Design a protein around this ligand. Structure first.
Ligand SMILES: [Cl-]
Length: 329
C-alpha cells in the first residue's frame, strides 16, 4: 500500500528534484517542481484523516518549497497574480515551518527549514532598510536581531554531534549561512567575543557536517570547505583589526590563520590547482605581518614566496602586487 509516510517521502522527492534541476541551471523546471511540491502538500492536507498527526517532516518540505519560490521568484512570479511578492513567500515559509513545531516526529529537517527561512527574512529586511523610506531610521540591528536570534535557536541543535547527518543538510541548503556570516561581520561590533566564537563554531560545524560522509563527492566537499576557510579567515581579520587599535589578539589571530592553512590544505588536496597557491601566500603573509618572532616571520615569508613562485611557474598570472613581493624578497 501507499502510506502517509510514503506520500511525505514522495513530497521530499519532488523538492529534491527541484534542487537537482536548479543545480543544472534549469530554473523553469525547478520552478515547476517547486509549485508541484506545494500542490502535492495541499493535496495531502485535504486527504489526511488528522492534520494534527502530519509529522514535522511534512511541514519542513512544504516550508522548503515556499522558500524556494522566493529564491526563484524572478521566474516564478510569471505564473502568479501580480499581488504576490518574494517576501510574502519567505513569510509563508516561516509560518508553514512554525506550524510544524507542534507536529509529531524528528525535528532536524524542520529546524533547518526554520533557520533557512529566518535568514532569508534577514536578508530581505536589510534590503528594505536600505530602500524603503519607512524603515530608513530604524537601526538594522534592531530590525533583524529577532530573526538572527531565531535562526541561531534552530541551528544550534543541528550543529551538535548528537544530531546525526540527514540528507536535507547539503552544502546548497546551507547557502543562507552566508547571510549570517555577513551579518556578524558587518555588525559584530555589537556582540561580545564569546557570542561570536559561539555562533561561528555553529556555522562551521554545520558546513563540516554537510559533507562528513567520506563518500561525499569532491565537488560538494569543496563548497563546504571553502565556506569554512572563509569563516576562519574572517575571524582572523576580526582579531587583526582589533590589533590595529596585545599578545592575546596576536595569539588568537594566529590560531585562526593557522586553522585557515589547515583547511586550505584540505581544499588543495581536493581540487589541486596552481592558482590556489596565491590564497596560501596571502594567509602566510598575514601570519608574517603580525608574528612577534623574527624566526617565524622569516619562515612565513619564505613559504609565501615559494607559493607565489610555484604558481607563476605553473602558468598562473601574477598581479604587480605578487610580482613585487617576490622581487623585494
Ligand atoms: Cl568524487
Amino acid at each position: 500500500v501507499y502510506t502517509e509516510e510514503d506520500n511525505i517521502s514522495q513530497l521530499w522527492g519532488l523538492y529534491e528534484m527541484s534542487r537537482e534541476k536548479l543545480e543544472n541551471d534549469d530554473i523553469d523546471a525547478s520552478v515547476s517542481l517547486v509549485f508541484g511540491t506545494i500542490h502535492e502538500a495541499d493535496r495531502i492536507l485535504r486527504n489526511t484523516e488528522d492534520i494534527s498527526t502530519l509529522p514535522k517532516d511534512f511541514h519542513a518540505a512544504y516550508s522548503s518549497a515556499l522558500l524556494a519560490v522566493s529564491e526563484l521568484f524572478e521566474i516564478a512570479q510569471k505564473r502568479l497574480k501580480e499581488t504576490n511578492t518574494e517576501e510574502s513567500y519567505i513569510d509563508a515559509a516561516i509560518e508553514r515551518a512554525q506550524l510544524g513545531l507542534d507536529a509529531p516526529g524528528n525535528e532536524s529537517r524542520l529546524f533547518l527549514a526554520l533557520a533557512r527561512a529566518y535568514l532569508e527574512k534577514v536578508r530581505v529586511l536589510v534590503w528594505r532598510h536600505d530602500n524603503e523610506e519607512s524603515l530608513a531610521n530604524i537601526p538594522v540591528t534592531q530590525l533583524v536581531n529577532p530573526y538572527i536570534e531565531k535562526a541561531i535557536q534552530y541551528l544550534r541543535p543541528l550543529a551538535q554531534d548528537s544530531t546525526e547527518y540527514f540528507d536535507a543538510l547539503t552544502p546548497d541548503s546551507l547557502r543562507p549561512l552566508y547571510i549570517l556570516s555577513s551579518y556578524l561581520f558587518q555588525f559584530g561590533d555589537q556582540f561580545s567575543e564569546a557570542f561570536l566564537l559561539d555562533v561561528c563554531s555553529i556555522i562551521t560545524a554545520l558546513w563540516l557536517k554537510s559533507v562528513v560522509d567520506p563518500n561525499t563527492p569532491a565537488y560538494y566537499k569543496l563548497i563546504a570547505q571553502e565556506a569554512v576557510l572563509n569563516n576562519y579567515t574572517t575571524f582572523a581579520e576580526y582579531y587583526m583589526d582589533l590589533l590595529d587599535n596585545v599578545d592575546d589578539l596576536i595569539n588568537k589571530a594566529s590560531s585562526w590563520l593557522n586553522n585557515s592553512v589547515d583547511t586550505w590544505n584540505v581544499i588543495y588536496t581536493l581540487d589541486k590547482s596552481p592558482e590556489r597557491l596565491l590564497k596560501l601566500a596571502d594567509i602566510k603573509m598575514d601570519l608574517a605581518q603580525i608574528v612577534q618572532d623574527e624566526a617565524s616571520q622569516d619562515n612565513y615569508l619564505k613559504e609565501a614566496c615559494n607559493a607565489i613562485k610555484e604558481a607563476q611557474g605553473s602558468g598562473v598570472e601574477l598581479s604587480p602586487d605578487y610580482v613585487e613581493f617576490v622581487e623585494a624578497y
